[PDB]
Design a protein around this ligand. Sequence first.
Ligand SMILES: *C(=O)/C=C/c1ccc(O)cc1
Length: 124
Amino acid sequence: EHVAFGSEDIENTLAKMDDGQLDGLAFGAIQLDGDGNILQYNAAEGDITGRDPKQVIGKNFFKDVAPCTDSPEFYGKFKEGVASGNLNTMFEYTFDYQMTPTKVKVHMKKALSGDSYWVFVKRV
Ligand SMILES: *C(=O)/C=C/c1ccc(O)cc1
């Protein structure tokens, strides 16, 4: 798939993409429910972070997979967006739990489908 990171209509392009389609993207893509449980997780994300995209589905991103994100700067933004029903924020961050610290750019954006939120990730 040819979709740019940060593209304005990304939620429309990715909407209802199956797991296989998402694996064609040139950046990491995670879909979370409103509680932070992982619904989808693509190959590019697993290459960035080391996690196995097959095993993380169903785990809680903030409580277990990615505790380094449970701060106001990441999780706090996420839950504000869930509470309001509108989320569109892009910021750099470092992923450092049980891994070499890895600097990324994160884009969180509400998905079109119900109770769904995208977390997009690229290397910086
Ligand atoms: C901090 O604990 C970050 C961890 C992490 C970020 C993103 C992922 O896809 C997996 C783990």
